[PDB]
Amino acid sequence: EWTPDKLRQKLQTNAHNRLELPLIMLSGLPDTVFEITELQSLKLEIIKNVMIPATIAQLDNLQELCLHQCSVKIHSAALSFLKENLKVLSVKFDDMRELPPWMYGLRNLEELYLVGSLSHDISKNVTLESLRDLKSLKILSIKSNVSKIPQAVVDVSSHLQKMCVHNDGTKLVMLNNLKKMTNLTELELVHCDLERIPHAVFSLLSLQELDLKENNLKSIEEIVSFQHLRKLTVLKLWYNSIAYIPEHIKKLTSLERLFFSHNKVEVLPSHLFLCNKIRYLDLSYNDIRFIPPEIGVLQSLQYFSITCNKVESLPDELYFCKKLKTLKIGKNSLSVLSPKIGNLLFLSYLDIKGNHFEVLPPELGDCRALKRAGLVVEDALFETLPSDVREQMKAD
């Protein structure tokens, strides 16, 4: 049925920029798969009871597998070859049998994407506790209900660099495992049902990027020990219910990426602006009433998204900072736009859609890095501009 020509014309690329075969709705693998030796990945979607032959040895370029609802078996020499060749895996398990026990037998694994539906009996998974066999595993994305962190995660404490969980409404407990992370750099706890910051997250000592998205954090209080995360530059805390940012964020002087958008903060603090190292500050769709005038310290800020907030008064101190490149104030509560905007030499993004304005000043022509495609304004207010001012951003 599946000639090699059909598989050659089936060939395409995946989300990881690899040559992937999306084998979907089949009974097994064809033997003409292995004639395409240039393949780098196979997407097996709902192909159960599959026995992989040794002819996979012809797939020298293969470095990725993506098993989607497939209860696949492998043969011994094929197992050895994929042990000596494979780097990336991504297995989804709608049913437990669809997760294969053979896949942990490799040792050259770097990246793993363990999406699926794990049972709450997590510590009983000896198949999980075989990730200690993997001597190069650095990316571990478990999109499943991980209530209690496995000791499988303990066994890969050092070699791991990216740790991702989508717990999907289950509380993340047994914190001593995440205390045992030594060389982990990227902790991505997306929707782990964290009622606050866990003490495990704070016992990290080598973190660089922390994401607590969709985690109902109550406060950011323990920050007296975030100073030990001098390696941290990325703080991802948006789509949350945080209502305030205390002064304690001054502890980290290496913070660059700060996310606080879609939060319950009603007034932005000035002591948040006291830190000047912060280059990325995201606060879109917040409830901020006004910006205190201490934001002038934030000179290195290249991203201040205050768009779709409740902000009615914008101080002139923010326009003193000229390094702000990506600035979005769209759908805000402003009344007039500040004439002094020309000092922002590096300003590519300006978004003012939805916000009520009386008359667009000619000083919008004073922006140098602004572009007409970068200046998202309505057609009616596009008409309310001088022709030279129109051409200033329209003509490249």
């Binding site: 020509d5 920029n17 495609a373």
Partner: protein, 393 residues
């Protein structure tokens, strides 16, 4: 058969006959067919109805023991011009291939080296006169004397031994008409001097020859016509400065090597157009890349380059900037000055956000701009509308 017709890389009409009892006569009734592909056809005879196959120019023989009719033999003598022969046994090759006179491209893939059949079977390629392309994926321990006899008219010698070293013995001096030499997977471990004795070569490929050192290239100025030095898939850990003497290079394929630093002398060559240094150990990119104005596709995929210098965007002819799988922290806005850019690869990088000026490139589209979806979302929805429209329009 009409719906079975396809097209090859050479834009010729194609027909792949795989695992049939014989060969259909309705295949031979076709007139628009150009390349017929005989794969795994056990012991068939070619009917003279090949007189209908006037556009037929490439006979592809894969494991096919073919017997031949005399009028069809004459027709193939006067029409057929490209024959590819793959065989498992040295008796599987047809003996009427020597009677072909219009044949110029031959692809003898499969072991020609056997006891008392080592190049004695193909000793009949002396009868071949117009042969210019001779691909040999045949595990040759030593290069034949028969190609030393033939190479006066040969113009391309692609030898794949799949792991067997050639004892060249400078025997290419009698082979003076080569314009291309593709020594692939030969495990040479050194560049021999036969390529150096030649003068007419313009495309030199030394793929997977385990070239640890390439210090000989100082003499490559003697080769005044070389334009594509494909020194890829080797063990090259550094580039000697005498490559600066090679001003005639246009494509320098050094990808999948162990080179960790580019000397600035390599950056003297103004004629470089395809600087592919992907899958290497480069940690920084020198600014002198702005001097290389003729560069079009700079592929530094899967390197250690953390920051692109602004001088990289001095060269306005960059058509395909393959920056994927690198450690690029941020891409500077000077890419908005580039116009020839058609496909830029940024997925798999440390890129924090996509700058707005990336939308300034006219010919760039979504298929060209391959990037992670969240990285795509960082562009303004009006700029994102422009790029999505370039996908649409």
């Amino acid at each position: 058969l009409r719906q079975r017709l396809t097209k090859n890389a050479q834009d010729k009409l194609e027909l792949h006959l795989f695992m049939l009892s014989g060969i259909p006569d309705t295949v031979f009734d076709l007139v628009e067919l150009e390349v017929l592909k005989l794969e795994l056809i056990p012991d068939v005879t070619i009917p003279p109805s090949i007189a209908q196959l006037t556009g037929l120019k490439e006979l592809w023989l894969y494991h096919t023991a073919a017997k031949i009719e005399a009028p069809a033999l004459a027709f193939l003598r006067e029409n057929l011009r490209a024959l590819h022969i793959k065989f498992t046994d040295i008796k599987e090759i047809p003996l009427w291939i020597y009677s072909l006179k219009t044949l110029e491209e031959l692809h003898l893939t499969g072991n020609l080296s056997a006891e008392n059949n080592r190049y004695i079977v193909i000793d009949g390629l002396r009868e071949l006169k117009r042969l210019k392309v001779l691909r040999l994926k045949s595990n040759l321990s030593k290069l034949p004397q028969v190609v030393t006899d033939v190479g006066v008219h040969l113009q391309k010698l692609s030898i794949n031994n799949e792991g067997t070293k050639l004892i060249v013995l400078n025997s290419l001096k009698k082979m003076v008409n080569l314009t291309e030499l593709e020594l692939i997977r030969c495990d040479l471990e050194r560049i021999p001097h036969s390529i150096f004795s030649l003068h007419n070569l313009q495309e030199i490929d030394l793929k997977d020859n385990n070239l640890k050192t390439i210090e000989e290239i100082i003499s490559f100025q003697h080769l005044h016509r070389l334009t594509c030095l494909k020194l890829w898939y080797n063990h090259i850990a550094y580039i000697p400065i005498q490559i600066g003497n090679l001003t005639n290079l246009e494509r320098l394929y050094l990808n999948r090597n162990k080179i960790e630093k580019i000397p600035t002398q390599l950056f003297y060559c103004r004629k470089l157009r395809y600087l592919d240094l992907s899958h290497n150990n480069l940690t920084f990119l020198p600014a002198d890349i702005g001097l290389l104005q003729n560069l079009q596709n700079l592929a530094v995929t899967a390197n250690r380059i953390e920051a692109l210098p602004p001088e990289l965007f001095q060269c306005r002819k960059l058509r395909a900037l393959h920056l994927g799988n690198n450690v690029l922290q941020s891409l500077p806005s000077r890419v908005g000055e580039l116009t020839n850019l058609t496909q830029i690869e940024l997925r798999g990088n440390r890129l924090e956000c996509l700058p707005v000026e990336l939308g300034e490139c006219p010919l760039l589209k979504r298929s060209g701009l391959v990037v992670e979806e969240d990285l795509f979302s960082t562009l303004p929805p009006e700029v994102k509308e422009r790029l999505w429209r370039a996908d649409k329009e």
